Every structure is written in C-alpha cells, then in structure tokens.
Amino acid sequence: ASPASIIQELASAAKQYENNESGAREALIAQSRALIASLEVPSEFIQHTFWSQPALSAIVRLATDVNLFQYLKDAQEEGLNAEALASKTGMDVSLFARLARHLVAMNVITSRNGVFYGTALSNGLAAENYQQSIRFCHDVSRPSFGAFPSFFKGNGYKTPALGTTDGPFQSAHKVDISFPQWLVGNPPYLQYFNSYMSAYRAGKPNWCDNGFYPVADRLLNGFDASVSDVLLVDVGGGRGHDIATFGSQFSPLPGRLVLQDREQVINSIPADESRQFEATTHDIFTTQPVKHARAYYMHSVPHGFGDEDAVKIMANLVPALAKGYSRVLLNEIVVDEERPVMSATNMDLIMLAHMGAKERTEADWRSILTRAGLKVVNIYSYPGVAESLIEAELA
Amino acid sequence: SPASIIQELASAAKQYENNESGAREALIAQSRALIASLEVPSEFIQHTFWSQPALSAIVRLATDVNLFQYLKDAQEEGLNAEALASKTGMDVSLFARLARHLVAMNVITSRNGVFYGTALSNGLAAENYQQSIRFCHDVSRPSFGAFPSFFKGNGYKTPALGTTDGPFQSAHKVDISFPQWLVGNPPYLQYFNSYMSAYRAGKPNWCDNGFYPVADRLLNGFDASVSDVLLVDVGGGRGHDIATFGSQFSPLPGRLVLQDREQVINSIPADESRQFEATTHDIFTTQPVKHARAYYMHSVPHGFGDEDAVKIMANLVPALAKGYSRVLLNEIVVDEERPVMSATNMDLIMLAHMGAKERTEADWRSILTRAGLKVVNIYSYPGVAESLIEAELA
Ligand SMILES: Nc1ncnc2c1ncn2[C@@H]1O[C@H](CSCC[C@H](N)C(=O)O)[C@@H](O)[C@H]1O
Ligand SMILES: Nc1ncnc2c1ncn2[C@@H]1O[C@H](CSCC[C@H](N)C(=O)O)[C@@H](O)[C@H]1O
Ligand SMILES: C/C(=C\Cc1c(O)c(C)c2c(c1O)C(=O)OC2)CCC(=O)O
Ligand SMILES: C/C(=C\Cc1c(O)c(C)c2c(c1O)C(=O)OC2)CCC(=O)O
C-alpha cells in the first residue's frame, strides 16, 4: 500500500478512535507504523532498527539503576534540568544529558528549554513492577534474541526438538537447564519474572471485561454451591493479579477464588486481609485437586510448553470437572497465520527465546484440547487484545 | 494530546503530497509521536524489548540464508513458506514464524500464504546493506547492550580518554581501540568500509540543489593557476561521497582527490570510469595537496576528542590558500534545545564505538578557532542529519 492510502486509513482509524470504538487505538498505532515503513529509506530503517532501539533499550535499562523515572514523576510539572538530574542520579552531567536527549528524541520523556519532564509513559515505568520488567527484559531476554542468528545456524535452522532444554535460551546463557530452573538459580530474576507478569499485558482489556467473555451469564448464573463452593480457579496465576482483578469486578462473590502456582511464587505473595483469593501451591503437571469448581482458568500457561506437556496440563483438569457444570477457560493467543499481527508474533518469538516454544492456531489448540479429553464450546476475542478466551468442556 | 498529533500528522501529510523539503521525514516523526501518545506502558515494553530485539535478530539471520535476495528475485510472483524454507535450508515452521514477524513489522508483505519482497527488503539484499546488518548486529549491538553495566561500573563517567576506556572495549573484551579491533578481526574492517556507503544512503547530499551552493562558492572563481585540484575528500572512505560530487558537477573543472587509510584505498576496485584519485593520507599529518579549491570531510572529526579534532582540522591549515581554499565540514550540529533522533542516534553510535560525541555549533566553533579556522556560514537541510560548515583561514 502506498503512503497516500495509508494516510487515508490513518485518518479513518482516527475518527474511530475519537468515537471510542473498541480496538481503534491499536489500529491507529498500526496505521502509524505502516506509514513509517512506507516512508523510510533503507538507511533510516537501519539506523532505527540497529541504533535507536538498542540505545533505547540500554538507556531505559540504565534508568532503573539511577531512579530516573521516579525522579521525573516526583517533579510533576516542574521538571528537572540536566544539572539537577545528574546530581540526584550521581551521573556525569554531560553523559546524562546525552542519554536523556535520546529518551526525548525517542518520545519517552519531553524537554522544554533545557528542562526535562516526565510523561504518562515514563511515570508508569516508575512503578516497581515495570522497573523489574525492564531489568528482566534487558538482562535475560535480550541475550537470547541476540543469540538467534548463531544458535539456529549452529542447530541447522531447526525448531527446538525438546523445547525447554535445547533452545536459544540455553545457548545465550550457557546452561543445560530449562528457563524455569535457571530462574531458581539466578536471583533476583525469579522475583523480577514474577513481578513482570503483572505488567506484560496490563492496561489492556481483561477476559472478564464487558464485551469480552460473558462471566455473569456463563459462570455466575447457574453457580451451585451444592456442587462446589469454589467459583474460579486460576491455574498458573502468578502472584494473583488476574484473579484479584476478577474478584473486584464480580463482588459480592458467590463462591471461592482459588489461586494455584509454584510454591516460591505463593510464598512471595504479601499477606493482605483485603485479598479476595486463597493463595495455594499446586503443580500444573499433577491432577487438579480442587474438584467440581464452576470455572478453571488459565492465562499464558500451556503456550510455553510443547504439545505433549500442554496436553498434560489440560488433561490434568479433566478428573476435576463436573459434567455439565465446570467450565474450562483458556486465555491464550490464537494465531491467525493468514493475518500475522505483531502481538501474536511478539509472544511467539518470546516463547522461542525463553521456553523453546510457540503460539498456537485455533486448529492447533483444538488438537491439544481434543487429545486432553476436552472440546471447545466457544472462542471469544476483543478488538486490540492479543489473547483469546477459549471456553471448553468435558468431551 | 493524541487528537493534536492526529491533526498535525495530516498537515505534514499534505505538505508531503506537495513534495516539500523534509516533509517525508516530518510525517515519520509525527507518526512516531502518535504511537507514543497512544501506547500504554505494557505495549511500549513489548515493542522495545520484544519486537525490536527479535526484528534485529531475524534481519541478521536473513543475511546468513540469502532471504532478501530470494524474495527480490521473486519480484511479483513471491514465495510461500515451503518454497523459501527449501531455498534457505530452514525448517518450514521455524521459517514461517520468523517471516511472519517480518510481515507484522512491515519489512516484507504476506497475502494468501505467499511472501513478497518490498522496496525495503530488496534494498537490504544489496551487499553493502548486508554487511551493514552484520556489522550492526555483531559489532555495534554488543556495545549498546553493555551501556548499563559498563557505566555502572565506571561511575557513570564520560570516557576520559575516548577510544580505549569505553563500552566498546568492555563489550568486546579488548584493551585496544575500535579501529585497531577492526584490523585484528576480519572481515569486520571490510564490513565497516562497505557500511560507510549505506549509513546515510538515499538522503540528500550536501552538494544537492538547495543545500550547499557548490557552483556559486566552488565552481565560480575556480582557478587552475592556483591549483588544478577542485576538491579533496579527506577521510572519504571508498569514494562513494566523492563519486557523487563528480557526477553532479561534470564536466569537472579540476581534479578530485580521495584521501583515506591505505587499507581503505587499496580495497577500491581499479576503474577506468572513475572520476577521482584514490590516495593514501593520514589525517593526522599535514595535508599534502596544496591550495585546492575545497577541502571536505564527512563524518570524520566527530569520531575524535577535542584535542584530536583540533589537530585533524589544523593539519588542513598549512595547505589552504588564503582567499581561495574552502573548508567544508559535513557534520551533525547538535541543537541541545531541540533533540532530534538523527543526532542522538549518531551521538551514541560515537559513544558505543569511538568513545566520542556529536557537537553543538558552539562546540564546533571552538575546535575550528583552536585549529586556526573561522566559520563562513553553516548550511542545513530539512530532514538531513548533517550540516555543511564552511570555514576558511582565520
Ligand atoms: N509446574 C508448574 N506448577 C505451578 N505453576 C507453574 C508451573 N509451571 C509454570 N507455572 C506458572 O505459570 C505461570 C506462567 S506465566 C503466566 C502468569 C499469569 N497467569 C499471567 O498471565 O500473568 C508462571 O507464574 C509460572 O510460575
Ligand atoms: N588517520 C586516518 N587517516 C586517514 N583516514 C582516516 C584516519 N582515521 C580515520 N579515517 C577514516 O575516516 C573515515 C570515517 S567514516 C566516514 C566515511 C565517509 N566520510 C562517509 O561519511 O561516508 C573512515 O573511512 C576512516 O578510514
Ligand atoms: C509458561 C512459562 C513461561 C513463559 C513466559 C510467559 O508465560 C510470559 C507471559 C512471558 C515470558 C515467558 O517466558 C517472557 O519472557 O515474557 C512474558 C513458565 C515459566 C516458569 O515456570 O518459570
Ligand atoms: C571516525 C571513525 C569512525 C566513527 C564512525 C562513523 O563515522 C560512522 C559514520 C559510523 C560509525 C562510526 O564508528 C558506526 O559505527 O556506524 C556509522 C573512524 C573509524 C576508523 O578509522 O576505523
């Protein structure tokens, strides 16, 4: 498509965004990027891909070491000049200004008259779960992507056969062990990974938001405490950000919210008597011990595993399901291979870089669920959201 | 506000359809400001730390399996995943997953299971861009990745000497300078020399119409009895910059002389249709070509510290003819009040390779005055990184 027709689509996406139409914000972002690629000459692509973005990753990472975004957030509308920020961060004034000006040029912070100002983006990155996300992404993920050309050249350009132990993660970090086992051995990145899961898709519609999955008519209507006093199980729910979101959307809750994850994750959950869920340890490769609950939910869990493991994860739910009663809710990307979206390719390559795994199409997922003993009732999606919601039941 | 940027984008769009200077670049910048006004922090994290590191890695891998060349030859027929996996020697599934990110990142296009090369991908199939990609992912990328750890360990100090105490040395585990690391790590010297023909390719040159007035300042008043040399390109690489000049102002009234390192000069194809003399010259020694009409440098002293940049320019001074010899310095002039990507890009490229920096107008004036030169005028062009600084004997 020519720039002229992208300019038209961009203006068409604009109106839809002003009219608050769902997904239009992401479509405005998409039309903006297509314009840039339609206008850039090859030398500008090279500078942006290989200079701006690597320097941007490095400076954003460095900012978490010197409290930069926290300082700019605190300054609110007054801002700080390079002399005041260098003093607070303990940095050479000239080095700071050169790194800060790239953040300006990269649209992360702003600057008027030698004063630097925080933005909505940088004030958000000042929160501690984004700070650890940044560290994880530059310290753990970046070496793995950088190893892609030499690793796949060294392995004959093959998909990782075993997955978890023969992927580019092992080669970049020089270990024989899997990504989950590496986290146990390399503090503080397990803490960084666990905080990072409350951030990697935050600020986007949840599966349980209006116009996505119908929680009230499918789960709440027909809830039967005489079958089980448990409303929802989040299997692999991390520190509980998703199940807590659910609790505040649908209170007063008629049944229990049960969180299951690894022992180390569960213990890292700070005590809180306003918390609406129970934090319990459970191995997803063991049979589900919470029986006949109304809903079993999974978000970004089996997409990190091979076919055999993912069928194991799903089939471990089967003994717990009450026929006609228990829903299985799978919150995962559904790849539409005829229409590659960046949100799908992003997570796909992140799976390859960490778990040696991939994102699945609708046909792939149905194969997984059929062999597990389940079958799809409906699939739900939302404009602009990466994940789908797959409702399944006993086959 | 997003709505503000949306209106501003449409304004620059109409100026772009009118073919105005720098409008194409302003449309790109307006589009980037729109993305930043709309993206939530998680979207920025995914694009910065997932999309972009994966994109660089796939584009680098593509230079190992002839991807962009296969898609270029395909032209309008295209190639599906099975056809390209066979041609590249790759697993069909691995290839398809890597190519769909290139599609999602707008580098190639996909329709009904067929992949198509683009103007961008076809150009990247050319060997100087192929070697540019390899240099950037192999040499430049590890230096950037070391910025947090290196500056944390050195106390967040600007490198004190420049070329041997910077992130490049720490990232590549050597105690020698970047140029010497190239001498001892083939073929990255050859990759660097080809890269110097691509890093700013396709953007208007200093000599283009509306940029520097070459004919008025250089051709008019050219005097063979003072010297028969029209322009010396000092540090001009393999001569791409000086070849462009000769083809814009031919029939040339005087000689063109290229100057660079012996290793650069001896790698230039011998060519009868060549319009310039390829000669070896150390920029840290006195300029041996006397009284030429124009002495020109492009992206040369910006790689060096203040003391050495003064020397580089001052070595031109004993050769200049007062009232006749121009000094034309084609370098970025940083506007610290208006930080643009073109300057901050190359500034940190200097830090990551040379331990140096780009300079403001006041910075350059100090170097030229210490070298014994005075600025005549500074020329700039909308959307171009570098300025053209004309100077002369003080
Ligand atoms: N064998 C296992 N037993 C229990 N939890 C596991 C597990 N293997 C992986 N997990 C958990 O599954 C999660 C995958 S990351 C997804 C986290 C969360 N559902 C979110 O969407 O943000 C991690 O928290 C990880 O700790
Ligand atoms: N001491 C020296 N003597 C001669 N050339 C030198 C030199 N030190 C650096 N150079 C040259 O300066 C060049 C800087 S890269 C700039 C190349 C070209 N002017 C362009 O803009 O495309 C390199 O080609 C390098 O070989
Ligand atoms: C499935 C799994 C990890 C896979 C996984 C994710 O799910 C998500 C959301 C993310 C990453 C990742 O590698 C990542 O790099 O960015 C986000 C288990 C990990 C463990 O058990 O430690
Ligand atoms: C001045 C100099 C190198 C500085 C320099 C450049 O000018 C340009 C344009 C570039 C780089 C660079 O490091 C780079 O990494 O990407 C483009 C001399 C090098 C030598 O003598 O080998």
Summarize the structure.
The first copy, chain A, is an alpha/beta fold and 395 residues long. Chain A has 18 helices and eleven strands. In chain A, helix 3 packs across helix 6 (93-105), helix 3 (42-66) crosses helix 8 (128-146) and helix 8 packs across helix 12 (189-196).
Order of helices and strands of chain A: HHHHEHHEEHHHHHHHEHEHEEHEHEHEE
Greatest contact pair?
A-B, 108 and 106 residues
Radius of gyration computed on alpha carbons of chain A? 23 Å
Helix content of chain A: 40-55%
- The amount of beta strand of chain A, in percent, is 5-15%
CATH architecture of the largest domain in chain A: 3-Layer(aba) Sandwich
Oligomer state of the chains in this structure: homodimer
The name of the CATH superfamily of the largest domain in chain A reads Vaccinia Virus protein VP39
| CATH topology heading of the largest domain in chain A | Rossmann fold
- The domain tally of chain A reads 3
What is the CATH C level class of the largest domain in chain A, in words?
Alpha Beta
- Give a quick account of the main beta sheet of chain A: strands, pairing sense, barrel closure: 8 strands, mixed
CA(first)-CA(last) distance of chain A: 45 Å
What sort of overall outline of chain A do the alpha carbons produce when their principal axes are compared? Answer: globular
GO molecular function (chain B): methyltransferase activity; O-methyltransferase activity; polyketide synthase activity
Active site (chain B): 302, 331, 358
Organism (chain B): Penicillium brevicompactum
Binding site for S-adenosyl-L-homocysteine (chain B): 193, 199, 233, 235, 240-241, 260-261, 282-283, 298
